[PDB]
Design a protein around this ligand. Structure first.
Ligand code: ZN
Ligand code: ZN
Ligand code: ZN
Ligand code: ZN
Lengths: 689, 251
């Protein structure tokens, strides 16, 4: 059976014992790669290998041959090729160099008539310095780390503890193979028989204290962990998983290789290294690693805890948890003066169109809060234009308000979109201005905007030329190709202009259902060209399209009503934004709608959520802002002895009921940690912490 | 990353995330509040999680000695006002109930010893108001339309809801975590098993470990035997997706 044995030193070197010795260097591909440094094949039929614990010379392998001869091969030149030979030849089962004295080489041999089995050699052909154990077979050897001379030998039927001072406590059991004393607990020993591994107690060496789980296949190697606080990894024959039965007894398994494992080796120096050698010499280094006890923090830090080290990730995208922190740090939402600038204070197209919509509702107020859909229910007196007449007051009282909520017209009854066009040209939106100007039945202004835009900052010139050829003939050449070629235009606003132009009057489905154009523009367009029967059906379709999709731009249509809660519920479900949910549902919403369980609970989370971030003062601003918008959601000082601008506050301690002026009390507690009144031990300031 | 000084069996933050409670492998629990150990306890601790601050700085420790110790704030070496040692078996975990439902602690040993303290100021008395017989997860829902629910994991998740009408509660799983709702109409369940599983309840390639939910329940941290604390999150299609991998050793 091939074996892997880490060297006591040279933490980058190891030897993979096989039919021929081979020393590798950790730099095949171990994980890391292994580079062969030496190969010894002069010791055939090797059955036991043990490192020389003394530093000089390094790489000295005591190769126990099958004939009993121990060859100190060098994988102080005197200790090279030494051929310690027993009195009678027989198999050499186990070898173990004493850690206290690294020049003894305890050798375990098979049975014989009258020859000692466990021979304690002397490194210095030779003669044993100590010969203990007769007419038996020492299957395993393990020097006790504490005592200088006590080798616990696993004989044929007993775990004899040979005392070299007087050549012996024996416990007759069937578990006598692979004795390994756990280093950290010097009073605990291990031994495996067949498929069962037993844990012993040297202080109570009468019966095995614990008998671990019996694996089906027989165990091949049981080795303690010199890195952890007790982890007896238990290899099993024809098993690809190292059953690390921790005796600390939580059982864990690790499968570092896809094939069977011959023998593993814990690294004495490296923190729990698991060099694994397959029968095909597939030397793979695995790592155990303790279970990670993750636990998030309100600041989104994963305090990864592996072993005895706390590795804080510290948020090592813009997640919603992280997003709200920057929003609240900039007083998001609370700046209810330039509501259109709230999204700017937010640092999103959905949020940008939402705050503009809420600004327009705030602007008009200074039934509108019921949304576009409820406003257009009572709209009556709709007329359809059969032919596009190129040049607003004819619209209903509901329609003109709807355009204002869409921003197309300024605050008032002025039937014009001219001021809106100038802002768009100033804002740089040149393709949107042409569409908005065209939708008010003005080709020439649309051409002028495109021509003016193309002049500054040249495709808009051609679009102006393309727009100038609007022909209403049913089978015209222009409508034949412009309708087909409109889909090959980059800007959506250019596409809808030709879609609206080439569409048969009455059914403007080429523009009403273009998701790349802002909903406000489509709704504003719909209020102007759709009849009452068509508009109500279309708005009900668009309302439900933002209702389920959780679109913030649908606040324009849904409004701050029972449906608005449903829409904003979908937005929370899709994303998880309650900070936007709380502020928007507080800005002008009616008492009955704001009294709903969902909207009240949305506030309850954000306040509780904002508490975990230590933003108490920021939260205090929200509660003050919430209370105004939602009315339904409403002795003598011990130092100066004066009976009852902040210094005049009267501090009352909840523990000892003592206190006085804030200015006096803070001064006393600044340098002291006791209640100033006599015969009082209460630490008023330090108690709350 | 930053390997601050500290084997911690379980490390968990408080509500504010400014103090860390760590349960060492030597049967000791420390309040590591630059995290410097500001306390020492010797415990009696499989899991140590804080309580809600308005209820006091109470740390619940689940031990292997068939007890669930609760160390209450008495200023430092906190004094155990109460000791929930009535559990016949070892308490696998001790996670406090959400603040809306009162002072309740769950010890899913299978006996869910839901100890309730009628007196907030005097928590020394623990009353097993409910007892339903590996992982204990609490539903953070506080809604009038959402009844409180208690989840129990077995080493496979059953949610027991205290029905108003009856006034009574009615791959191996390693840890179950309920995401904070924040007004959601559905609950997201994260269960630690051979494979990380995420499920929606609307009214590592190895053995996973104690996964936790962020303060908003959107970004997920799932840990397993692979040794890498993989960070997970949602996607544009409202589906779970990988968002990053963090190294335990700090690399
Ligand atoms: Zn005074
Ligand atoms: Zn006092
Ligand atoms: Zn005073
Ligand atoms: Zn006091």
């Amino acid at each position: 059976k091939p074996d892997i044995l880490w060297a006591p030193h040279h933490v980058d070197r190891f030897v993979v014992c096989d039919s021929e010795l081979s020393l590798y260097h950790v730099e095949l591909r171990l994980s890391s790669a292994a580079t062969l440094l030496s190969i010894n094949s002069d010791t055939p039929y090797m059955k036991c290998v043990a490192w020389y614990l003394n530093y000089d010379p390094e790489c000295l392998l005591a190769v126990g041959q099958a004939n009993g001869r121990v060859v100190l091969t060098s994988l102080f030149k005197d200790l090279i090729g030494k051929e310690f030979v027993p009195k009678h030849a027989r198999q050499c089962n186990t070898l173990a160099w004493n850690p206290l004295d690294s020049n003894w080489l305890a050798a375990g041999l098979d049975k014989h008539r009258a020859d000692f089995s466990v021979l304690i050699w002397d490194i210095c052909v030779t003669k044993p310095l100590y010969e203990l154990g007769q007419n038996d077979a020492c299957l395993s050897l393990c020097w006790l780390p504490r005592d200088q001379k006590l080798l616990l030998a696993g004989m044929h039927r007993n775990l004899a503890i040979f005392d070299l001072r007087n050549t012996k406590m024996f416990v007759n059991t069937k578990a006598v193979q692979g004795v390994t004393v756990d280093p950290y607990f010097h009073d605990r020993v291990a031994s495996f028989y067949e498929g069962q591994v037993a844990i012993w107690d040297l202080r109570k060496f009468e019966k095995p204290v614990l008998t671990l789980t019996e694996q089906p296949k027989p165990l091949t190697k049981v080795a303690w962990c010199p890195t952890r606080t007790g982890l007896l990894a238990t290899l099993t024959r024809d098993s690809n998983i190292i059953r690390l039965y921790d005796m600390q007894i939580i059982e864990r398994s690790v499968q570092p290789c896809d094939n069977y494992i011959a023998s593993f080796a814990w690294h004495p120096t490296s923190q729990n290294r698991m060099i694994v050698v397959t029968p095909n010499r597939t030397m793979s280094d695995f790592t155990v690693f303790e279970r990670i006890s993750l636990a998030w923090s309100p600041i989104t830090s994963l305090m990864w805890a592996c072993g005895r080290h706390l590795y804080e990730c510290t948020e090592e995208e813009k997640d919603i948890a992280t997003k709200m922190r920057l929003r609240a740090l900039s007083r998001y939402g609370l700046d209810t003066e330039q509501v259109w600038r709230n999204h700017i204070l937010a640092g999103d197209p959905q949020l940008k169109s939402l705050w503009y919509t809420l600004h327009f509702m705030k602007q008009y107020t200074e039934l509108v809060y019921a949304g576009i859909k409820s406003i257009v229910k009572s709209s009556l007196g709709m007329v359809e234009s059969s032919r596009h007449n190129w040049s607003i007051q004819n619209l209903n009282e509901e329609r003109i308000l709807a355009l204002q909520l869409c921003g197309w017209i300024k605050k008032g009854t002025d039937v014009d979109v001219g001021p809106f066009l100038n802002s768009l040209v100033q804002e740089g939106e040149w393709e949107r201005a042409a569409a908005v100007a065209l939708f008010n039945l003005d080709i020439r202004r649309a051409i002028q905007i495109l021509n003016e835009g193309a002049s500054s900052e040249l495709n808009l010139n051609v679009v102006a030329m393309a727009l100038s050829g609007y022909t209403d003939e049913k089978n015209s050449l222009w409508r034949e190709m412009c309708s087909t070629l409109r889909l090959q235009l980059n800007n959506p606003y250019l596409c809808v202009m030709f879609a609206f132009l080439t569409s048969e009057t009455g059914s403007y489905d080429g523009v009403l259902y273009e998701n790349k154009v802002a909903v406000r523009d489509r709704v504003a367009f719909a209020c102007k060209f759709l009849s009452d029967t068509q508009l109500n059906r279309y708005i009900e379709k668009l309302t439900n399209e933002m209702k389920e999709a959780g679109n913030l731009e649908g606040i324009l249509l849904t409004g701050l009503t029972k449906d608005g809660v449903d829409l904003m519920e979908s937005y929370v479900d899709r994303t998880g934004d309650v900070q936007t949910a709380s502020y928007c549902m507080l800005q002008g919403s009616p008492l009955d709608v704001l009294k709903d369980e969902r909207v009240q609970y949305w506030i309850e989370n954000y306040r509780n959520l904002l508490d975990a971030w230590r933003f108490w003062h920021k939260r205090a601003e929200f509660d003050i802002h919430r209370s105004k918008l939602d009315p339904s959601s409403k002795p003598r000082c011990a130092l100066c002895l004066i009976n009852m601008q902040f210094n005049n506050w009267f501090t009352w301690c909840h523990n000892c009921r003592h206190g006085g002026h804030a200015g006096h009390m803070l001064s006393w507690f600044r340098d002291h940690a006791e209640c100033p009144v006599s015969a009082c031990t209460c630490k008023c300031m330090q108690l709350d912490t | 990353a930053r390997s601050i000084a500290a084997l911690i069996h379980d490390v968990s933050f408080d509500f504010h995330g400014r103090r860390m409670a760590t349960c060492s492998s030597d049967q000791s629990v420390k309040v590591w509040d630059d995290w410097h150990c500001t306390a020492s306890w010797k415990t009696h601790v499989w899991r140590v999680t804080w309580a809600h601050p308005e209820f006091g700085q109470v740390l619940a420790s689940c031990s292997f000695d068939r007890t669930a110790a609760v160390w209450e704030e008495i200023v430092s070496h906190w004094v155990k006002r109460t000791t929930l040692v009535d559990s016949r078996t070892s308490v696998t975990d001790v996670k406090f109930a959400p603040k809306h439902m009162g002072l309740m602690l769950a010890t899913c040993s299978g006996i869910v010893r839901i100890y309730e303290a009628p007196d907030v100021m005097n928590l020394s008395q623990w009353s097993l108001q409910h007892e339903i017989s590996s992982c204990i997860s609490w539903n953070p829902s506080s809604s009038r339309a959402h009844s409180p629910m208690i989840a129990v994991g077995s080493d496979k998740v059953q949610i027991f809801e205290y029905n108003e009408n009856t006034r009574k509660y009615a791959d191996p799983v390693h840890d179950i975590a309920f995401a904070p709702n924040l007004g959601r109409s559905f609950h997201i369940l994260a269960i630690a098993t051979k494979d990380v599983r995420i499920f929606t309840l609307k009214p590592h390639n190895s053995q996973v470990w104690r996964v936790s939910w962020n303060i908003t329940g959107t970004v997920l941290a799932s840990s397993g035997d692979d040794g890498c604390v993989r960070l997970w999150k949602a996607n544009y299609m409202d589906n779970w997706k990988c968002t990053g991998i963090l190294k335990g050793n700090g690399s």
